[PDB]
Scaffold this active site. Structure first.
Site, PDB file in Angstrom:
ATOM      1  N   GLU A   1       1.796   4.304   6.807  1.00 59.92           N
ATOM      2  CA  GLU A   1       2.399   5.313   5.953  1.00 59.92           C
ATOM      3  C   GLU A   1       3.237   6.137   6.957  1.00 59.92           C
ATOM      4  OE1 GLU A   1      -0.011   7.481   3.266  1.00 59.92           O
ATOM      5  OE2 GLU A   1      -1.535   5.778   2.960  1.00 59.92           O
TER       6      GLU A   1
ATOM      7  N   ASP B   1      -3.843  -1.349   7.618  1.00 57.07           N
ATOM      8  CA  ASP B   1      -4.607  -0.780   6.682  1.00 57.07           C
ATOM      9  C   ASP B   1      -4.637  -1.835   5.419  1.00 57.07           C
ATOM     10  OD1 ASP B   1      -5.866   0.552   4.406  1.00 57.07           O
ATOM     11  OD2 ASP B   1      -4.479   2.081   4.567  1.00 57.07           O
TER      12      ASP B   1
ATOM     13  N   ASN C   1      -6.646  -1.931   3.113  1.00 54.11           N
ATOM     14  CA  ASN C   1      -7.282  -1.570   1.816  1.00 54.11           C
ATOM     15  C   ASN C   1      -8.452  -2.454   1.159  1.00 54.11           C
ATOM     16  OD1 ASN C   1      -6.248   0.967   0.820  1.00 54.11           O
ATOM     17  ND2 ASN C   1      -3.972  -0.050   0.842  1.00 54.11           N
TER      18      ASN C   1
HETATM   19 MG   LIG Z   1      -4.272   2.677   1.865  1.00 53.74          MG
HETATM   20 MG   LIG Z   2      -2.801   6.782   2.041  1.00 53.66          MG
END
Ligand SMILES: [Mg+2]
Ligand SMILES: [Mg+2]
Length: 462
Positions: A204, A349, A351
């Site tokens: 991100e 990440d 998820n």
């Molecule tokens: Mg995420």
């Molecule tokens: Mg996020």
């Protein structure tokens, strides 16, 4: 004056600064990391001198009169400081003052023409405590050659935070000023530079955050980085130049690789039997960063560093399975075909919590066709299949209670996966305590600049 020898001479482009920017937000106890785009020179051979305002308000900016860099004010309104380093860390005594940087570009052989610029902001008080303060007690020094200090961190993209909606619905417990990009970046710069790491994988990352915040901070501390966009934001990998050089890059887009690279032909054949699931997978824009690093200490040592951010949706279990299958097949190709079996570090990440099909697949090397995640989003997008992969992988920081902690959700979503046949863990830098994380209900906070927690560990070759 005029150089009388120019008619006889082809002459050098002299060292010159081609970007000079100060941060727009400055705080006591946090490093001020100037952006320097230096042509025909290097920051290491350049000269820096920091000034501070004589007292608050003393330096009144010249009205209407141009500089191409900053406001301009009388020289006599400024006091010369001690500091001749690129990075200046203000003290409490600096609160209320603007700063000025004078710098001279150099290449080690000669200097070019100096430039100077003033901050538009004053030094503010910093937060009383940050969650990474205690962690930094473990990371005071760059590690020895035998070690690889590795970081994985989703740093929360401004493109998803900045919103009034995000501020009022996802993060209503967080002080609005602490949600601001410039505040979070100052904390992130202090956090990451204080880890004194060797390999840093981020998710991100806004494009402008990469260029204007991370690169200037981390290059001041000896790291170089590469960026790969997803759509609105993307991935970054940084490496410590004194320990590694970038040998090759092998980034892919999962949908692109799956449909067009014969490497994944067998997986594609399983998926074409499930038209609806296939459509959903190929519509995703998740990418995979892959960087092969050469040790500067041992010519025989190379490492394959992968970084990703997988599909986010809670019902996207089967999609994350297929994305990880593509990732691991691709990483096998790079680490075992293009190079003859080099160690793998795979940050991200993901998820995915430890109870997911994706996680099962990663740590077991297989997943059965009857796993429930093959219908994670219902019957029409069902895609039952058996997968296998080549690696013996473990999570270097284990399975923390959580790595993402927001008002409406928490879970362990982030991992630093390592080839356990080739690498071992020397130490894990402890995550903040639960009481730290909940001081301001959840994350982010005035004390913590993301809704995720950075994973930091020291790895060693086996
Ligand atoms: Mg995420
Ligand atoms: Mg996020």
């Amino acid at each position: 004056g005029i150089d009388p020898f120019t008619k006889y001479k082809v002459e050098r482009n002299p060292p010159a600064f081609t970007e000079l920017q100060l941060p727009r937000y400055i705080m006591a106890g946090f490093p001020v990391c100037p952006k320097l785009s230096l042509e025909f020179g290097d920051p290491a051979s350049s000269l820096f001198r920091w000034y501070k305002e004589a007292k608050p308000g003393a330096a009144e900016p010249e009205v209407g009169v141009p500089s191409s860099l900053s406001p301009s004010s009388p020289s006599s309104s400024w006091t010369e400081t001690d500091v001749e380093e690129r990075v200046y860390t203000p003290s409490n005594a600096d609160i209320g003052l603007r700063l000025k940087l004078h710098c001279t570009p150099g290449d080690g052989q000669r200097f070019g023409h100096s430039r100077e610029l003033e901050s538009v902001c004053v030094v503010e008080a910093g937060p009383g405590t940050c969650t990474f303060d205690h962690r930094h007690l473990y990371t005071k020094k760059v590690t020895e050659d035998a070690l690889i200090r590795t970081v994985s961190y989703n740093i929360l993209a401004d493109t998803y935070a900045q919103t009034e909606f995000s501020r009022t619905v996802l993060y209503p417990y967080c002080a609005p000023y602490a949600l601001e990009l410039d505040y979070r970046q100052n904390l992130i710069q202090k956090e990451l530079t204080g880890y004194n790491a060797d390999v840093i994988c981020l998710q991100e990352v806004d494009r402008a955050v990469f260029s204007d915040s991370l690169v200037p901070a981390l290059e001041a501390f000896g790291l170089e980085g590469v960026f790969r966009i997803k759509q609105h934001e993307g991935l970054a990998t940084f490496y410590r130049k004194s320990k590694f050089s970038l040998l090759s890059q092998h980034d892919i887009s999962f949908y692109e690789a799956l449909e067009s690279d014969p490497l994944h032909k067998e997986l594609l054949e399983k998926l074409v039997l499930y038209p609806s699931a296939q459509e959903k997978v190929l519509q995703r824009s998740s990418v995979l960063q892959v960087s092969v690093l050469q040790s500067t200490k041992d010519s025989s040592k190379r490492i394959c560093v992968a970084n990703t951010h997988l599909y986010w949706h809670p019902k996207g279990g089967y999609i994350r399975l297929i994305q990880m299958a593509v990732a691991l097949a691709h990483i096998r190709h790079v680490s075992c075909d293009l190079y003859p079996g080099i160690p793998v570090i795979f940050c991200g990440d993901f998820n995915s919590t430890p109870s997911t099909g994706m996680y099962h697949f990663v740590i077991n090397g297989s997943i059965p066709e009857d796993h429930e995640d093959w219908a994670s989003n219902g019957e029409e997008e069902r895609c039952n299949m058996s997968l296998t992969h080549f690696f013996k992988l473990k999570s270097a920081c284990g399975e923390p209670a959580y790595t993402n902690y927001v008002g409406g959700f928490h879970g362990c979503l982030d991992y630093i996966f390592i080839d356990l046949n080739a690498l071992e863990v020397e130490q894990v830098i402890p995550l903040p305590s639960h009481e730290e994380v909940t001081t301001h209900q959840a994350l982010p906070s005035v004390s913590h600049p993301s809704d995720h927690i950075a994973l930091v560990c020291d790895l060693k070759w086996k």
